[PDB]
């Protein structure tokens, strides 16, 4: 099983602020759908909460929420008490995806063999309570696309990385 991580970050490494994603780049949500469609999507409890209620569970995917609380309620999702448990509920899924947030990416990173990153050209100065992207060392190899204009007026680009 190829455990993948998918996220969007500013160039500075911010993925979340004030419980939200601090930009609007539609092309990123489209990409996210394209990558994750048909697979398990594993998320931390706070990410689950960040999603608008009507958008969740994410359709066409098996949703899993990681919590320490074995009685946590996620309507339309399986709740798991660890990342290892989350990966077990993925079953025979050949390519489960971890979809955030900061805490869960760090948990998953040792299992991961693929990362799909959208970089957003926005000037965000890291605050103390920002959610931050994991750093990838050079065991990770891949390709970086060209800068693209979003409908938003910001630029973005895709990075695809893998390791054995
Ligand atoms: N730009 C992007 O690509 C994305 C951005 N985000 C943003 O990221 C932020 C959320 O990230 P973050 O705050 O780090 O939270 P997470 O989504 O990573 O969830 C953290 C929670 O996961 C549970 N948890 C953590 N570690 C463990 C463990 N070892 N075992 C079991 N459960 C565990 C806990 O839930 P509990 O307390 O219930 O036990 C904890 O509160 C939001 O702002 C969101 O909008 C999210 C997804 C993608
Ligand atoms: C489809 O809507 C959402 C998707 C995500 C997760 C996510 C979004 N973009 C990327 N590139 N990777 C991800 N893991 C996170 C969200 O909010 C925190 C979303 O709603 C706004
Ligand atoms: Cl990067």
Look up residue 3 and give its two tokens: 């455990």
DSSP code for 104: H
Q: Residue 43 — φ and ψ, nearest 5°?
A: -140, 155
DSSP code for 77: S
Structural domains of the chain ordered from first start: 1-164 (3.40.430.10)
Per the CB < 8 A criterion, the answer to whether 33 and 150 are in contact is: no
Nearest CA to ligand 2 atom 20: 51
CA distances from 58 to 12, 28, 136 (A): 28, 15, 27
DSSP code for 109: G
Name the nearest CA neighbour of 6 among 23, 18, 30, 19.
30
Stated as kind and residue range, the H or E segment containing 149 is strand 148-149
Pocket test for ligand 2, best of 18, 24, 25, 29 (most atoms within 8 A of CB): 29
Q: Cα(159) to centroid of ligand 3, in Å?
A: 7
Between β-strands 97-98 and 40-44, what pairing exists: parallel, antiparallel or unpaired?
parallel
Rounded to whole angstroms, the Cα distance separating 101 from 110 reads 15
Rounded to whole angstroms, the Cα distance separating 125 from 122 reads 9
Residue 131 labelled as part of a binding site: no
Look up residue 4 and give its two tokens: 């993948």
Handedness of CA 125, 126, 129, 133 (dihedral sign): positive
Q: Cα(70) to centroid of ligand 3, in Å?
A: 34
Look up residue 44 and give its two tokens: 């931390």
Q: Residue 120 — φ and ψ, nearest 5°?
A: -105, 125
Q: Resolution limit in angstroms?
A: 2.0
Per the CB < 8 A criterion, the answer to whether 120 and 25 are in contact is: yes
Which SS3 state, helix, strand or coil, does residue 103 take? Answer: helix
> What does the DSSP assignment read for 18-55?
TTB-SS--HHHHHHHHHHHTTSEEEEEHHHHHHS-TTT
Q: What HEC string does 104-150 produce?
A: HHHHHHHHEEEEEEEEEECCCCCCCCCEECCCCCCCCEEEECCCEEC
How many residues belong to the chain?
A: 164
Stated as kind and residue range, the H or E segment containing 112 is strand 112-121
């Amino acid at each position: 099983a190829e455990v993948g991580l998918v996220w969007a970050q500013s160039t500075s490494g911010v993925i979340g602020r004030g419980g939200d994603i601090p930009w609007s780049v539609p092309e990123d949500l489209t990409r996210f759908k394209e990558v994750t469609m048909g697979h398990t999507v594993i998320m931390g409890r706070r990410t689950w909460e960040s999603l608008p209620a009507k958008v969740r569970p994410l359709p066409g995917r098996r949703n899993v929420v990681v919590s320490r609380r074995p009685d946590f309620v996620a309507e339309g999702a399986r709740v798991a008490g660890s990342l290892e448990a989350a990966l077990a509920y993925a079953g025979s899924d050949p390519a489960p995806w971890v979809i955030g947030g900061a805490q869960i990416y760090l948990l998953a990173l040792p299992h991961a063999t693929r990362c799909e990153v959208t970089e957003i050209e926005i000037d965000l100065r890291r605050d103390d309570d920002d959610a931050l992207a994991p750093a990838l060392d050079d065991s990770w190899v891949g390709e970086t696309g060209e800068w693209l204009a979003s409908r938003s007026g910001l630029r973005y680009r895709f990075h695809s990385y893998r390791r054995d």
